[PDB]
Design an enzyme around this catalytic site. Structure first.
Site, PDB file in Angstrom:
ATOM      1  N   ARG A 105       0.822  -1.205   0.000  1.00 50.47           N
ATOM      2  CA  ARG A 105       0.000   0.000   0.000  1.00 50.47           C
ATOM      3  C   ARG A 105       0.861   1.262   0.000  1.00 50.47           C
ATOM      4  O   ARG A 105       0.460   2.285  -0.566  1.00 50.47           O
ATOM      5  CB  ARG A 105      -0.931   0.009   1.216  1.00 50.47           C
ATOM      6  CG  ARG A 105      -2.236  -0.796   1.088  1.00 50.47           C
ATOM      7  CD  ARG A 105      -3.158  -0.495   2.293  1.00 50.47           C
ATOM      8  NE  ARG A 105      -4.419  -1.218   2.261  1.00 50.47           N
ATOM      9  CZ  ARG A 105      -5.279  -1.263   3.272  1.00 50.47           C
ATOM     10  NH1 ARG A 105      -5.000  -0.636   4.407  1.00 50.47           N
ATOM     11  NH2 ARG A 105      -6.408  -1.952   3.159  1.00 50.47           N
ATOM     12  N   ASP A 165     -19.224   4.573   4.467  1.00 47.55           N
ATOM     13  CA  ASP A 165     -19.096   3.926   5.769  1.00 47.55           C
ATOM     14  C   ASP A 165     -20.347   4.138   6.605  1.00 47.55           C
ATOM     15  O   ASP A 165     -20.838   3.206   7.253  1.00 47.55           O
ATOM     16  CB  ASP A 165     -17.859   4.459   6.511  1.00 47.55           C
ATOM     17  CG  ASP A 165     -16.583   4.351   5.682  1.00 47.55           C
ATOM     18  OD1 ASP A 165     -16.451   5.065   4.669  1.00 47.55           O
ATOM     19  OD2 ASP A 165     -15.695   3.565   6.045  1.00 47.55           O
ATOM     20  N   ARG A 168     -23.273   1.980   5.174  1.00 44.75           N
ATOM     21  CA  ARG A 168     -23.181   0.595   5.634  1.00 44.75           C
ATOM     22  C   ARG A 168     -23.643   0.472   7.072  1.00 44.75           C
ATOM     23  O   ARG A 168     -24.390  -0.454   7.426  1.00 44.75           O
ATOM     24  CB  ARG A 168     -21.750   0.080   5.504  1.00 44.75           C
ATOM     25  CG  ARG A 168     -21.310  -0.158   4.061  1.00 44.75           C
ATOM     26  CD  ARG A 168     -19.914  -0.748   3.995  1.00 44.75           C
ATOM     27  NE  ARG A 168     -19.521  -1.129   2.637  1.00 44.75           N
ATOM     28  CZ  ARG A 168     -18.486  -0.625   1.975  1.00 44.75           C
ATOM     29  NH1 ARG A 168     -17.708   0.299   2.535  1.00 44.75           N
ATOM     30  NH2 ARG A 168     -18.221  -1.054   0.747  1.00 44.75           N
ATOM     31  N   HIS A 192     -11.821   7.106   6.307  1.00 42.63           N
ATOM     32  CA  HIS A 192     -12.525   6.051   5.598  1.00 42.63           C
ATOM     33  C   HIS A 192     -11.862   4.711   5.891  1.00 42.63           C
ATOM     34  O   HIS A 192     -10.634   4.615   5.960  1.00 42.63           O
ATOM     35  CB  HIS A 192     -12.516   6.339   4.093  1.00 42.63           C
ATOM     36  CG  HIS A 192     -13.005   5.200   3.257  1.00 42.63           C
ATOM     37  ND1 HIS A 192     -14.264   4.658   3.401  1.00 42.63           N
ATOM     38  CD2 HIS A 192     -12.408   4.503   2.263  1.00 42.63           C
ATOM     39  CE1 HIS A 192     -14.424   3.681   2.527  1.00 42.63           C
ATOM     40  NE2 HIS A 192     -13.312   3.566   1.826  1.00 42.63           N
TER      41      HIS A 192
HETATM   42  N1  LIG Z   1     -13.815   6.134  -0.967  1.00 44.10           N
HETATM   43  C1  LIG Z   1     -14.654   4.914  -0.965  1.00 44.10           C
HETATM   44  O1  LIG Z   1     -15.486   4.725  -0.146  1.00 44.10           O
HETATM   45  C2  LIG Z   1     -14.414   3.888  -2.079  1.00 44.10           C
HETATM   46  C3  LIG Z   1     -13.300   4.197  -3.099  1.00 44.10           C
HETATM   47  N2  LIG Z   1     -12.880   3.216  -4.081  1.00 44.10           N
HETATM   48  C4  LIG Z   1     -11.635   3.451  -4.834  1.00 44.10           C
HETATM   49  O2  LIG Z   1     -12.002   3.905  -6.303  1.00 44.10           O
HETATM   50  C5  LIG Z   1     -10.921   3.681  -7.031  1.00 44.10           C
HETATM   51  C6  LIG Z   1     -11.305   2.883  -8.316  1.00 44.10           C
HETATM   52  O3  LIG Z   1     -11.839   1.617  -7.943  1.00 44.10           O
HETATM   53  P1  LIG Z   1     -12.018   0.572  -9.228  1.00 44.10           P
HETATM   54  O4  LIG Z   1     -13.006   1.127 -10.230  1.00 44.10           O
HETATM   55  O5  LIG Z   1     -12.439  -0.748  -8.757  1.00 44.10           O
HETATM   56  O6  LIG Z   1     -10.521   0.525  -9.856  1.00 44.10           O
HETATM   57  P2  LIG Z   1     -10.135   0.152 -11.404  1.00 44.10           P
HETATM   58  O7  LIG Z   1      -8.653  -0.105 -11.478  1.00 44.10           O
HETATM   59  O8  LIG Z   1     -10.911  -1.047 -11.902  1.00 44.10           O
HETATM   60  O9  LIG Z   1     -10.529   1.506 -12.290  1.00 44.10           O
HETATM   61  C7  LIG Z   1      -9.763   2.673 -12.091  1.00 44.10           C
HETATM   62  C8  LIG Z   1      -9.591   3.336 -13.519  1.00 44.10           C
HETATM   63  O10 LIG Z   1      -8.673   4.577 -13.284  1.00 44.10           O
HETATM   64  C9  LIG Z   1      -7.933   4.656 -14.635  1.00 44.10           C
HETATM   65  N3  LIG Z   1      -6.645   5.347 -14.500  1.00 44.10           N
HETATM   66  C10 LIG Z   1      -5.411   5.083 -14.079  1.00 44.10           C
HETATM   67  N4  LIG Z   1      -4.683   6.192 -14.282  1.00 44.10           N
HETATM   68  C11 LIG Z   1      -5.471   7.116 -14.842  1.00 44.10           C
HETATM   69  C12 LIG Z   1      -5.185   8.403 -15.239  1.00 44.10           C
HETATM   70  N5  LIG Z   1      -4.093   9.433 -15.315  1.00 44.10           N
HETATM   71  N6  LIG Z   1      -6.130   9.154 -15.776  1.00 44.10           N
HETATM   72  C13 LIG Z   1      -7.385   8.650 -15.939  1.00 44.10           C
HETATM   73  N7  LIG Z   1      -7.679   7.372 -15.533  1.00 44.10           N
HETATM   74  C14 LIG Z   1      -6.702   6.612 -14.988  1.00 44.10           C
HETATM   75  C15 LIG Z   1      -7.647   3.440 -14.871  1.00 44.10           C
HETATM   76  O11 LIG Z   1      -7.395   3.230 -16.295  1.00 44.10           O
HETATM   77  C16 LIG Z   1      -8.999   2.585 -14.364  1.00 44.10           C
HETATM   78  O12 LIG Z   1      -9.840   2.322 -15.558  1.00 44.10           O
HETATM   79  C17 LIG Z   1      -9.977   2.867  -6.160  1.00 44.10           C
HETATM   80  O13 LIG Z   1      -9.027   3.728  -5.658  1.00 44.10           O
HETATM   81  C18 LIG Z   1     -10.916   2.384  -5.043  1.00 44.10           C
HETATM   82  O14 LIG Z   1     -10.138   1.986  -3.833  1.00 44.10           O
HETATM   83  C19 LIG Z   1     -13.700   2.028  -4.295  1.00 44.10           C
HETATM   84  C20 LIG Z   1     -14.917   1.733  -3.390  1.00 44.10           C
HETATM   85  C21 LIG Z   1     -15.189   2.568  -2.100  1.00 44.10           C
HETATM   86  N1  LIG Z   2      -7.562   7.831   5.653  1.00 45.09           N
HETATM   87  S1  LIG Z   2      -6.515   7.274   4.482  1.00 45.09           S
HETATM   88  O1  LIG Z   2      -5.058   7.130   5.079  1.00 45.09           O
HETATM   89  O2  LIG Z   2      -6.694   8.208   3.214  1.00 45.09           O
HETATM   90  C1  LIG Z   2      -6.947   5.583   4.128  1.00 45.09           C
HETATM   91  C2  LIG Z   2      -6.048   4.603   4.485  1.00 45.09           C
HETATM   92  C3  LIG Z   2      -6.330   3.288   4.192  1.00 45.09           C
HETATM   93  C4  LIG Z   2      -7.505   2.952   3.526  1.00 45.09           C
HETATM   94  C5  LIG Z   2      -7.814   1.509   3.206  1.00 45.09           C
HETATM   95  C6  LIG Z   2      -8.631   1.318   1.950  1.00 45.09           C
HETATM   96  C7  LIG Z   2      -8.208   1.355   0.564  1.00 45.09           C
HETATM   97  C8  LIG Z   2      -6.885   1.633  -0.052  1.00 45.09           C
HETATM   98  C9  LIG Z   2      -6.619   1.306  -1.373  1.00 45.09           C
HETATM   99  C10 LIG Z   2      -5.383   1.568  -1.949  1.00 45.09           C
HETATM  100  C11 LIG Z   2      -4.405   2.153  -1.189  1.00 45.09           C
HETATM  101  F1  LIG Z   2      -3.196   2.397  -1.761  1.00 45.09           F
HETATM  102  C12 LIG Z   2      -4.616   2.474   0.135  1.00 45.09           C
HETATM  103  C13 LIG Z   2      -3.598   3.094   0.913  1.00 45.09           C
HETATM  104  C14 LIG Z   2      -2.797   3.608   1.608  1.00 45.09           C
HETATM  105  C15 LIG Z   2      -1.826   4.238   2.497  1.00 45.09           C
HETATM  106  C16 LIG Z   2      -2.505   5.217   3.497  1.00 45.09           C
HETATM  107  C17 LIG Z   2      -1.521   5.340   4.687  1.00 45.09           C
HETATM  108  C18 LIG Z   2      -0.540   4.136   4.551  1.00 45.09           C
HETATM  109  C19 LIG Z   2      -1.133   3.237   3.439  1.00 45.09           C
HETATM  110  C20 LIG Z   2      -5.872   2.222   0.690  1.00 45.09           C
HETATM  111  N2  LIG Z   2      -9.216   1.101  -0.231  1.00 45.09           N
HETATM  112  N3  LIG Z   2     -10.301   0.913   0.593  1.00 45.09           N
HETATM  113  C21 LIG Z   2     -11.512   0.560   0.021  1.00 45.09           C
HETATM  114  N4  LIG Z   2     -12.655   0.777   0.545  1.00 45.09           N
HETATM  115  C22 LIG Z   2     -13.710   0.246  -0.204  1.00 45.09           C
HETATM  116  C23 LIG Z   2     -15.174   0.380   0.239  1.00 45.09           C
HETATM  117  O3  LIG Z   2     -16.011  -0.123  -0.545  1.00 45.09           O
HETATM  118  O4  LIG Z   2     -15.308   0.943   1.326  1.00 45.09           O
HETATM  119  C24 LIG Z   2     -13.340  -0.396  -1.300  1.00 45.09           C
HETATM  120  S2  LIG Z   2     -11.530  -0.390  -1.504  1.00 45.09           S
HETATM  121  C25 LIG Z   2      -9.960   1.003   1.913  1.00 45.09           C
HETATM  122  C26 LIG Z   2     -10.880   0.829   3.084  1.00 45.09           C
HETATM  123  C27 LIG Z   2     -10.853  -0.576   3.676  1.00 45.09           C
HETATM  124  C28 LIG Z   2     -12.039  -1.103   4.446  1.00 45.09           C
HETATM  125  C29 LIG Z   2     -11.760  -1.617   3.048  1.00 45.09           C
HETATM  126  C30 LIG Z   2      -8.399   3.949   3.157  1.00 45.09           C
HETATM  127  C31 LIG Z   2      -8.099   5.254   3.450  1.00 45.09           C
HETATM  128  F2  LIG Z   2      -8.949   6.234   3.097  1.00 45.09           F
END
Ligand SMILES: NC(=O)C1=CN([C@@H]2O[C@H](COP(=O)(O)OP(=O)(O)OC[C@H]3O[C@@H](n4cnc5c(N)ncnc54)[C@H](O)[C@@H]3O)[C@@H](O)[C@H]2O)C=CC1
Ligand SMILES: NS(=O)(=O)c1ccc(Cc2c(-c3ccc(F)c(C#CC4CCCC4)c3)nn(-c3nc(C(=O)O)cs3)c2CC2CC2)cc1F
Ligand SMILES: NC(=O)C1=CN([C@@H]2O[C@H](COP(=O)(O)OP(=O)(O)OC[C@H]3O[C@@H](n4cnc5c(N)ncnc54)[C@H](O)[C@@H]3O)[C@@H](O)[C@H]2O)C=CC1
Ligand SMILES: NC(=O)C1=CN([C@@H]2O[C@H](COP(=O)(O)OP(=O)(O)OC[C@H]3O[C@@H](n4cnc5c(N)ncnc54)[C@H](O)[C@@H]3O)[C@@H](O)[C@H]2O)C=CC1
Ligand SMILES: NC(=O)C1=CN([C@@H]2O[C@H](COP(=O)(O)OP(=O)(O)OC[C@H]3O[C@@H](n4cnc5c(N)ncnc54)[C@H](O)[C@@H]3O)[C@@H](O)[C@H]2O)C=CC1
Ligand SMILES: NS(=O)(=O)c1ccc(Cc2c(-c3ccc(F)c(C#CC4CCCC4)c3)nn(-c3nc(C(=O)O)cs3)c2CC2CC2)cc1F
Ligand SMILES: NS(=O)(=O)c1ccc(Cc2c(-c3ccc(F)c(C#CC4CCCC4)c3)nn(-c3nc(C(=O)O)cs3)c2CC2CC2)cc1F
Ligand SMILES: NS(=O)(=O)c1ccc(Cc2c(-c3ccc(F)c(C#CC4CCCC4)c3)nn(-c3nc(C(=O)O)cs3)c2CC2CC2)cc1F
Lengths: 331, 331, 331, 331
Positions: A105, A165, A168, A192
């Site tokens: 990570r 969060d 959920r 988060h």
């Molecule tokens: N904040 C939250 O509660 C949640 C956040 N996420 C996060 O959303 C993000 C995407 O999740 P997924 O769709 O499953 O990932 P994914 O890898 O399937 O899709 C991400 C897309 O970003 C594109 N990408 C990479 N570099 C790029 C660039 N310069 N410019 C434009 N596009 C670029 C990629 O081509 C890819 O199509 C992840 O970081 C995931 O952890 C997912 C669920 C919950």
């Molecule tokens: N406050 S923060 O520092 O911003 C932060 C730190 C860690 C994480 C974990 C994480 C991550 C995640 C993806 C990719 C990553 F690279 C990192 C990281 C990091 C660094 C950051 C400090 C030391 C390593 C993290 N994704 N992710 C997802 N959540 C969902 C959902 O559906 O809720 C789907 S994926 C989660 C939440 C986990 C319950 C599933 C989230 C986050 F918000």
């Protein structure tokens, strides 16, 4: 002589300017779920899609356009160049690197910072007045990155944060009580994911504080183990990831709810990641989730939740950890 | 004495019974796109998902459940056992196998037939009065297969058919004329996909016939190449498949439009695949798309479109072809 | 020290600039049915009401505000002074004088011009870029009046026209055929009210022209009396007025449907009254309903419907009538 | 030879049975506001209207019918004979008499009771399993009368009660805080109107109790006089009545909100009037508003709100007044 001019008389050839435009950057599972949810809630008169993978981007765009008959968003465009995003009211960032097996990570967040390095100046160039909604993880750190690179005022940079969060949480609470999640109120704040903070004092139905009704709520003297609800809030996210590979549908719906408040100036309160310096005992530039009033200018106001000593210390620790990691990011 | 009982006084313990329940079988990209579109249009009080892949199935269910806060569908269930589907009003079949490396299409259709031989008896046991909406391809063949296995009357076995093709046609028509596809009218009938039939005589805006206005419409002499608009209806689907690997959003939105007419008893007219023996000159039991009136009993009526000799001879050739395959399918 | 400041911290203090604002002038039954339909379709982020009866105007505004919990329009205001209407995208005129016992249309027409002589300047004053939607009767005459006083270009002055007449046509058609009105296509054009013109050639279900199927359609020798449907189009309006005193719900819904296309830039086609000089053989500045493409700039295009000689002659006769009445209006 | 038969081939002529039918009895402004709101939220597949004024009834029905193009409710019926209400899932009573000039309110309640003595058995006759939602005033008394006349179990007799008073409370609260009423939480319980009880301990934003931040909240010694907010809940209704003659839009929206929970089985929590005997310290057969879980069986559960000594006493005194009055009525 053509059919179109035989059938239709043009009386004003004005170049079309979008008025309620939304851009989604990153068309992975999450970006497309945000896209379909925004489309089905009629939140935009134009939707733009951006990615770096050109054929997948064009195919997702076409697939949506083929459903135009069933939508009320008359213009769907896409492209790798950001001219397609011009004058967006709201830009949603769902882009990220694909984690490789065995990858740290620590390595991953820098790779996502490097992506944001390219994305954010391009978004700013073509929509200088837009609101930025950051979804990519780690969302709290990445929202700080987006804020720094864009130079936007803090009201216009919003992290998805604990909105999902908290959704959920209310689902699980609704499952325990036999009540729709709409009528189960409860707030998850701070970071988060793993380090989020449940605010037990605020959990209620019909304004009835569960904690007051049942003082052992959230402790180890709780016979019904209601703290497990927050453990499950975190664990159910990992379970979805384990079972289908990623999460998508719920974050898409939660993002659309956020977009609804911003696009229609509703001034609803949501738990989203905001630049929290000088409140809740935080002295550094970090983004954490607190209840925020959302509208046409982004975050106009936030709610000052009274927190226990235990809850405050967890927030302050999150703030310290966020700041120290951010100082090690390479911009 | 539990928290739930301190908070809530119960006056009624009545078995919950769903009134507007929909099941989707197959939680691939198509099945999940149908699910999210149905959920966001508030068509069901209960959604059930079925598949054979158990982890993917549970994860998709959980992911939808976590967005319950933003939906109006209070119960979402899943399982490989069809007891979760009991008393569905409408069951949508989006299950199929995947073509292997260079696998014949005739061998692939038999494998889908073997899948329906498991699915359809299980659906009928638990929802003997539901309507069946077949989406899996080849959809006209598989709709007939579902009909013969189910023992349902033809009004309750519906193939997605040319509803999506017609929707693509109106998007493409609208792009040429600068008009929303809702205001562009035009019908593609017969087989889904390659052999579909554009009914040029029906193409109109504001009840103004393009064909009468532009008599080259649909011909090879046409310098405006309006035949290309139907060529794109087939080709744009192959292109989406090539570009993102599959199509999903457009079929999900169009299935939801069909589900809306059925579940709300709207009696709207949609081009869907129906048992057409005795109409358009056809004498074999095959399913082809014609305009059908859709409501609470499935297909209650169909519109008898006047076809030219060329269009009519294409429907007949399609029927003969469908008949010849079906007689050599083992089920 | 106040509760508001104790609970909420303000970070942004920026003025509220309305973004998707709609005004309704005249809060009689028609104005309030337009208001409620606009509110329940989530078409505006701000709704402004204007009338000259001040008590009724405030009571209506407060009644709507008391329902704000169930709406997605956060700002509802009202005033006799047109500063409350500033910066509307769409301004809907439903204002008119009350007919006295024994007064004819020719006694009341000038009383409504006097009305428009006061309304239209104040509207143009505070919303110089708005689209004008005229509902007040005589609607074709009053839209001419609004167009002349406003000084707006022809694209931005829209008369409700035969939108409602056509909606009634499709309801009656669907009643006869057992098809939902959405799937019944048919166009009533020209003057709203007694002199409206049904385009028989345009009536179709699924692109099947009823006239071709049934050559006597629209003639006096029609054994099935399909002319009576248009007679009922006119008579049903008189019947509703006779029965409940006025009509309001259907015109409300049709106005909201018009607003949808305008506010969301859909480019749908609707039968609305527009400045038709130079088209359809008309040679005077008069407003008649034709199918118009409606979007963010109002009427940007219109459809050239091919008319029969009988239908075209009646359009000229209407144009002659309007122009002769208009010469007698006092501006 | 008939055009419809040339156009449409009928495969089944099964009798239509409505599945999600709602009846509204009484087509005054309140009943019609309930109808349009229910129509625009797509809660019903059939809407039935009943009144005694036969002309007004038919005109309202037709007026709604003419907007069918813009609705998703295919069948709108009306009549003075309750045959048209058969098999309603939900029957909404908004019928009442007009108080004569100088008519004692108590004589008027008897007259509304006599109305109910006619309406309620006819309703039960044609829809024995419906849920009864009573709106007419005095609504708590009349809800009791409907329950006693109907013979229905307590779960299927619901009074509109304080659902409107709480919507007003949240609107007023939101205007004071600059927050959308959706995010403002607050409960008005007891009798509808004058004697309603605000529950100050339940008032919160984001789960932050206003009572705990601002202890004077609700006292006469309150610096900011938040007691006026509840006083305005009562005075605003009288003010709308004074200003426009009646209230309609807000009650229509609140009733549609209740219908949505019931018809979709949401199990949302609403403050509605329910038979309160044995709960909250009440010993009489009276209906009072408490937070109720609303679903397909009506009121299956209610929330036990912790009340202060004086809230409990006001609720006890309201039960006493209602029972004494219910003793003076004849039915
Ligand atoms: N904040 C939250 O509660 C949640 C956040 N996420 C996060 O959303 C993000 C995407 O999740 P997924 O769709 O499953 O990932 P994914 O890898 O399937 O899709 C991400 C897309 O970003 C594109 N990408 C990479 N570099 C790029 C660039 N310069 N410019 C434009 N596009 C670029 C990629 O081509 C890819 O199509 C992840 O970081 C995931 O952890 C997912 C669920 C919950
Ligand atoms: N406050 S923060 O520092 O911003 C932060 C730190 C860690 C994480 C974990 C994480 C991550 C995640 C993806 C990719 C990553 F690279 C990192 C990281 C990091 C660094 C950051 C400090 C030391 C390593 C993290 N994704 N992710 C997802 N959540 C969902 C959902 O559906 O809720 C789907 S994926 C989660 C939440 C986990 C319950 C599933 C989230 C986050 F918000
Ligand atoms: N008729 C139309 O207009 C359209 C139809 N389709 C068709 O929809 C079908 C599904 O498409 P995709 O989601 O992309 O394919 P997919 O292969 O990704 O999804 C198929 C799912 O069906 C499941 N399955 C296989 N056997 C099963 C069994 N006995 N019981 C339950 N589930 C079973 C599979 O596990 C899989 O999860 C395909 O046949 C596709 O051709 C695709 C788009 C347009
Ligand atoms: N184009 C169409 O299809 C239809 C048009 N209409 C027309 O809508 C108009 C209103 O209908 P109703 O509400 O039933 O009439 P109404 O008499 O009940 O209400 C008209 C309101 O305009 C107000 N008024 C008068 N002068 C005004 C001024 N300078 N400024 C602001 N307000 C002013 C009046 O106080 C009144 O409240 C009528 O002309 C009606 O014929 C009604 C149905 C069909
Ligand atoms: N519970 C709440 O919060 C609110 C309730 N209301 C109440 O709704 C009720 C109706 O309000 P409005 O429409 O303004 O009154 P209204 O007098 O205009 O309409 C009542 C209709 O009931 C009909 N009626 C009388 N006897 C009948 C009988 N045997 N059978 C069928 N219909 C009969 C009448 O013809 C009348 O059209 C009133 O009692 C009002 O106090 C209004 C707003 C707030
Ligand atoms: N009328 S029918 O016999 O029912 C029939 C025959 C062939 C096809 C083609 C086909 C097929 C398809 C998948 C797998 C198959 F095995 C067969 C087959 C076969 C045999 C039986 C005829 C020749 C061997 C077919 N999928 N598919 C898809 N469409 C979409 C979309 O988004 O529209 C996505 S995939 C299409 C439509 C193409 C435009 C994309 C469809 C069909 F309806
Ligand atoms: N094309 S035009 O000249 O613009 C024009 C002329 C006459 C009318 C009649 C009229 C009128 C009407 C009210 C009041 C009026 F003062 C005049 C007038 C006039 C002058 C201009 C002709 C000679 C004096 C008119 N209202 N009204 C209504 N329609 C509805 C509905 O529900 O459709 C409800 S009311 C109708 C339509 C009739 C079916 C009810 C409408 C109209 F569009
Ligand atoms: N708990 S209860 O006994 O059920 C009961 C008693 C009195 C009232 C008042 C009342 C009444 C009302 C109409 C007509 C009436 F005849 C009576 C009475 C009475 C008897 C009762 C004791 C002796 C004579 C009442 N209407 N009404 C309306 N509210 C609205 C709104 O928008 O809120 C519109 S009208 C209100 C609420 C007031 C804010 C306007 C309501 C009520 F729920």
């Amino acid at each position: 002589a053509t059919l179109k001019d035989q059938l239709i008389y043009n009386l004003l050839k004005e170049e079309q300017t979008p008025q309620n435009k939304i851009t989604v950057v990153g068309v992975g599972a999450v970006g497309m779920a945000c896209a379909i949810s925004i489309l089905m809630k009629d939140l935009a008169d134009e939707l733009a899609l951006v990615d770096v993978i050109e054929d997948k981007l064009k195919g997702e765009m076409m697939d949506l356009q083929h459903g135009s008959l069933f939508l009320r968003t008359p213009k769907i465009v896409s492209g790798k160049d950001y001219n397609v995003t011009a004058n967006s009211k709201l830009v949603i960032i769902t882009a990220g690197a694909r984690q490789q097996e065995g990858e740290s990570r620590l390595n991953l967040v820098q790779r996502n910072v490097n992506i944001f390095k390219f994305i954010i100046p391009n978004v700013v160039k073509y929509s200088p007045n837009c609101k930025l909604l950051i979804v990519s993880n780690p969302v709290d750190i990445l929202t700080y990155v987006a804020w720094k690179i864009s130079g936007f005022p803090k009201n216009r940079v919003i992290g998805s944060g604990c909105n999902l969060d908290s959704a959920r949480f209310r689902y699980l609470m609704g499952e325990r009580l036999g009540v729709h999640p709409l009528s189960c109120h409860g707030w998850v704040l701070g970071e988060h994911g793993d380090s989020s903070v449940p605010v037990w004092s605020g959990m209620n139905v019909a304004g009835v504080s569960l904690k007051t009704l049942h003082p052992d709520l959230g402790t180890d003297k709780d016979k019904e183990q209601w703290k497990e609800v927050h453990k499950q809030v975190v664990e159910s996210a990992y379970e979805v990831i384990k079972l289908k590979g990623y999460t998508s549908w719920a974050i898409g719906l939660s993002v659309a709810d956020l977009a609804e408040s911003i696009m229609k100036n509703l001034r609803r309160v949501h738990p989203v990641s905001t630049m929290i310096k000088g409140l809740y005992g935080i002295k550094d530039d970090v983004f954490l989730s607190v209840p925020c009033i959302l509208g046409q200018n982004g975050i106009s106001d936030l709610v000052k939740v009274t927190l226990t000593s235990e809850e405050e210390a967890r927030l302050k620790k999150s703030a310290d950890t966020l700041w120290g990691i951010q100082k090690e990011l390479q911009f």
